[PDB]
Amino acid sequence: GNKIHPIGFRLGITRDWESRWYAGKKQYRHLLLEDQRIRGLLEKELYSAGLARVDIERAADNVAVTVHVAKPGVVIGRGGERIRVLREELAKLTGKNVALNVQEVQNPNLSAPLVAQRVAEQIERRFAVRRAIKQAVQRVMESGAKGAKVIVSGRIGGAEQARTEWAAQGRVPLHTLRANIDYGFALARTTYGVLGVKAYIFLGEV
RNA sequence: GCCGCGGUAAUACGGAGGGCGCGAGCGUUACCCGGAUUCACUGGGCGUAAAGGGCGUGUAGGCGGCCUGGGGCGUCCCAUGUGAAAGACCACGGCUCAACCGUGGGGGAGCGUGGGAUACGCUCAGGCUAGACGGUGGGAGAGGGUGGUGGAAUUCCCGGAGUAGCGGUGAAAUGCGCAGAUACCGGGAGGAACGCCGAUGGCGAAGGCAGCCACCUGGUCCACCCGUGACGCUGAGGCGCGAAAGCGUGGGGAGCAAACCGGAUUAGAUACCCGGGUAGUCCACGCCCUAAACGAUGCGCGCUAGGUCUCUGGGUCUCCUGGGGGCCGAAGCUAACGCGUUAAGCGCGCCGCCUGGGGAGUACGGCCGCAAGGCUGAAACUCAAAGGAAUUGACGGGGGCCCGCACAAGCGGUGGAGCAUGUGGUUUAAUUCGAAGCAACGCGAAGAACCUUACCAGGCCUUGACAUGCUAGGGAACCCGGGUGAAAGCCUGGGGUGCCCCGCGAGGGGAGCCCUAGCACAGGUGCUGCAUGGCCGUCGUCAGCUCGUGCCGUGAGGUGUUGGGUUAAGUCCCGCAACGAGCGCAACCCCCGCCGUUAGUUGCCAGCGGUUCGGCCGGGCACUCUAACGGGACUGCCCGCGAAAGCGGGAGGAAGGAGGGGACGACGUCUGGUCAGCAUGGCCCUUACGGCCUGGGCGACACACGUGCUACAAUGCCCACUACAAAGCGAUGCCACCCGGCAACGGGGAGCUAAUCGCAAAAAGGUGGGCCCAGUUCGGAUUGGGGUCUGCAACCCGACCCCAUGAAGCCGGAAUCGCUAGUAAUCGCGGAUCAGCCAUG
Ligand SMILES: [Mg+2]
Ligand SMILES: [Mg+2]
Ligand SMILES: [Mg+2]
Ligand SMILES: [Mg+2]
Ligand SMILES: [Mg+2]
Ligand SMILES: [Mg+2]
Ligand SMILES: [Mg+2]
Ligand SMILES: [Mg+2]
Ligand SMILES: [Mg+2]
Ligand SMILES: [Mg+2]
Ligand SMILES: [Mg+2]
Ligand SMILES: [Mg+2]
Ligand SMILES: [Mg+2]
Ligand SMILES: [Mg+2]
Ligand SMILES: [Mg+2]
Ligand SMILES: [Mg+2]
Ligand SMILES: [Mg+2]
Ligand SMILES: [Mg+2]
Ligand SMILES: [Mg+2]
Ligand SMILES: [Mg+2]
Ligand SMILES: [Mg+2]
Ligand SMILES: [Mg+2]
Ligand SMILES: [Mg+2]
Ligand SMILES: [Mg+2]
Ligand SMILES: [Mg+2]
Ligand SMILES: [Mg+2]
Ligand SMILES: [Mg+2]
Ligand SMILES: [Mg+2]
């Protein structure tokens, strides 16, 4: 057990807060809680799309919600009827009355959370783990970026023994509180147990 | 069949499905050949894996230089006879094919006879000298045997001199000394070995061999080319030689020393250590014959780079030529290590020997011995190995280097006591569960009176305290009373249905919902963290772990990452078949150090006038502070050591060589922790391992330990007065101020959503004074009694106030802990959880 979360270790600099807004004292908790709820819905729904991150800004009964996807068309929908149900379904949950934006992902092949879920899926589809991995890695590696690295839990293949798979190219400096490394964790339910998927992606500098 | 497969995911057991193979057959068992170059003629081996005979002498035998000529045995060639048939090969043919059978055809090694060749081998004769042996002359030598002399030292005896201890050991003791030892001087007897030279050397067939001297004797090397003329190399059997030990007869016996006698160490010592002591070690003759008898490498001969050191002879002599010993190395060899003209290379001759480990060098037979034993030397059985060299790593009571409060130096403490808190044991109806060496034990639990709580008893509910959905039925939302009850819950009573569609309307249908019943199912802190994610601990904040390309190597891998130096560091320098790069190290980030800019409802007579002199008001942002940005140390500067890095010192400076401290914890280790945070695979429970409730339990003890607090006192303790802080906290809260009460605190009550109100006095400190060394104005436990507050409730189990009681305790056994600075020690204040609170954490 080691290696702090590269994100939170960088929250001060090269990386920000998924929920930026103020309050406190007697609202925070209630308000904060409110966030887990949305993120709750957006995640169980906009999956097949590529939920990458969920920014949530606030200014008193006026939330933001800016879902990050790779295939925004799925979030949107036919002509945009589904961004009507979600946007509306979100209210039946929070009467705060908020909007909902959707920013496409510039080559999801560079979004940790995605580079992982990608892998995740493959695993659940019973795909050689060692490959999906080496595969994903090269992808990132091959789509710009100066460094990538994917890690997969144990039971790789339903092995009776809890193993670990590696693979990783370029530079990936988790200690350099400046590097600006994207992180992401994909869980992998499976007939033989649960497998965790970690993906780091290193982009430029500042 | 070999390797193995099965201990709760088995492609290796059993069945199913499927699939491959082969098909009137397919498997099996046994035996022969093959694979097996694993008896090797074709086609192997012996330095370390199994394998060189301990050495020599030499018999049978095998092998044999150069030239010419006879034979022409081998050998080769031609002819021919034989080589029946069947089978085999081939062509053709018959039974519808084939199998099977018929016809014809081919070849055959060997052997007989005839003829031919004559290179090579055999034989014969003749001749030579390049092998070998002899001769001439020279050299070195611990080669051997015989006799004899020499000095040192040791022990024993005699004399002198001289004491009280000597000797011995990790310490000791036995032992020896006042019948005087040891230690010193002199003299005498005896045995054994033989210093320095001496060596990395010599000689010998091996074993083995060193004081010197003489004598008898072996071998050997060189120079000369003088003599013989192939006379040669090997060598089964035989014979002889053969360390030490042991054996026989006899002598000798100084020292040493099996056995044995005591001493000591040890849990026990028939052992390592110590003091004695026999065989023995010694010599003679006789016997034994083994050995890591090792170069672990048979003998001889020819051939294939060098260099370097060394012994010995010749030499036109620090150069070349011969013999011997070592080192390093060409080609080559080798599994590698390594070997390499002192080959483990290239070749030829001959000899010995191996053919998996264990059983066995054992059993039996035989030969040999005085005996101990020796040489020759199996199998049954059994196991899949035994094994060799080298690579990585780990480990060592191995070594060099080197870090960390790791040790030491030092300060305070723990182990003693009272208490607090955790843990074990005891125990209990239950005292829920986990954590266990460091890396469990005030740890999860930043808060157990109920709740929490998962345990225990008792009462009680079952689609349930929770999620989506189905079938039949009544009524449906929901709100308010009553009875039994500890509560839960069970039983039960009355207000009250609208919502959409169709219908004059009664009324019917139908959506969200409630309830009985059946169902899918909830739920489970119920096992498994050796099925897992997740997160954490830990070696380690240690300085390391790797990758690419190239190079080395059959290969595993090595090289770079080692080496010298430097560093907090695989940090940096220089070197180097490596050149780089990644993860880590560093830097980036935060807080504290000086400074500036920005901003002043913080702050100040600092500058000014008014004052209820409390900066209160005017006013001003200077200073303080506030919080943002930014500057600033880089060994940059000077001296000096160094190749360089880097190191010592100095200067300016708030700050110096990473300015202090954070945050940050590599590839990996441990089947490390957690299925009780959460997640999830499998197993298990579903009138119950589900759920509610009250009460109890998680809080007991006569015990032990851990982590703590408070002390045992006057470098103190009590009272009065009075001074300086930081960091946090506060609406369903912090509470100034007054009165009340000794007080806890109650009642009234202002300000504050808070740099500019409150929690707050900070305490140690300072000032006056008291106590006066005593269990004492030290210590506060325990207990009695009263009382306040929180909370529905404080018996089991709260905190607090007041009086009374005032205990253990006079500084802690073995052992053990933290800390290198603003740290340790010491003194308070704050917060999280939290009604309150056992926080001395
Ligand atoms: Mg054969
Ligand atoms: Mg062989
Ligand atoms: Mg001849
Ligand atoms: Mg003939
Ligand atoms: Mg015939
Ligand atoms: Mg002749
Ligand atoms: Mg002689
Ligand atoms: Mg001979
Ligand atoms: Mg003898
Ligand atoms: Mg004798
Ligand atoms: Mg004697
Ligand atoms: Mg051998
Ligand atoms: Mg000469
Ligand atoms: Mg020589
Ligand atoms: Mg060599
Ligand atoms: Mg070579
Ligand atoms: Mg023997
Ligand atoms: Mg016998
Ligand atoms: Mg051996
Ligand atoms: Mg070995
Ligand atoms: Mg230190
Ligand atoms: Mg010490
Ligand atoms: Mg104690
Ligand atoms: Mg330095
Ligand atoms: Mg370091
Ligand atoms: Mg760092
Ligand atoms: Mg375990
Ligand atoms: Mg407890």
What domains, with CATH codes, occur in chain A?
A: 16-106 (3.30.300.20), 107-206 (3.30.1140.32)
Separation between Cα atoms, residue A151 and residue A154, nearest integer Å: 10
Pairing type for strands A181-188 and A195-202 reads antiparallel
Structure's resolution in angstroms:
3.2
Structure tokens, A93? 């949950």
Helix (H) or strand (E) run with residue A112 in it: helix A112-124
Structure tokens, A67? 């879902």
Sign of CA dihedral A150, A148, A170, A130: positive
Three-class DSSP category at A121: helix
Pick the closest to residue A10 from A181, A152, A204 (CA basis): A181
Q: Strand pairing partners for A5?
A: none
Structure tokens, A103? 């920013």
CA–centroid distance, A161 to ligand 20, in Å, is 35
The size of chain A, in residues, is 206
Q: Which residues contact A106 (CB under 8 A, 6 or more apart)?
A: none
Residue written as tokens 């957006």?
A: A42
Method of determination?
Answer: X-ray
* Number of Cβ within a 10 Å radius of residue A184: 22
* Number of Cβ within a 10 Å radius of residue A51: 22
Phi and psi for A119 in degrees, rounded to 5?
-55, -55
Question: Residues 154-173, chain A: which have Cβ under 7 A from strand B?
Answer: 154-155, 157-162, 164, 166, 171-173
CA–centroid distance, A106 to ligand 23, in Å, is 68
Three-class DSSP category at A152: strand
User: Do the beta carbons of residue A18 and residue A53 sit within 8 Å?
Assistant: yes
* Number of Cβ within a 10 Å radius of residue A187: 14
Cα within 13 Å of Cα(A184), Cβ side? 26
Q: Is the CB of A180 under 7 A from strand B?
A: no
Q: Strand pairing partners for A196?
A: A187
Pick the closest to residue A54 from A115, A110, A100 (CA basis): A100
Torsion of CA A143, A195, A173, A106, to 10 degrees: 30
Q: Which residues contact A175 (CB under 8 A, 6 or more apart)?
A: none
> C-alpha angle with apex A28: A26 to A31, nearest 5 degrees?
110
CA–centroid distance, A14 to ligand 9, in Å, is 93
Question: Residues 26-85, chain A: which have Cβ under 7 A from strand B?
Answer: 26
Structure tokens, A62? 């006026």
Separation between Cα atoms, residue A123 and residue A169, nearest integer Å: 21
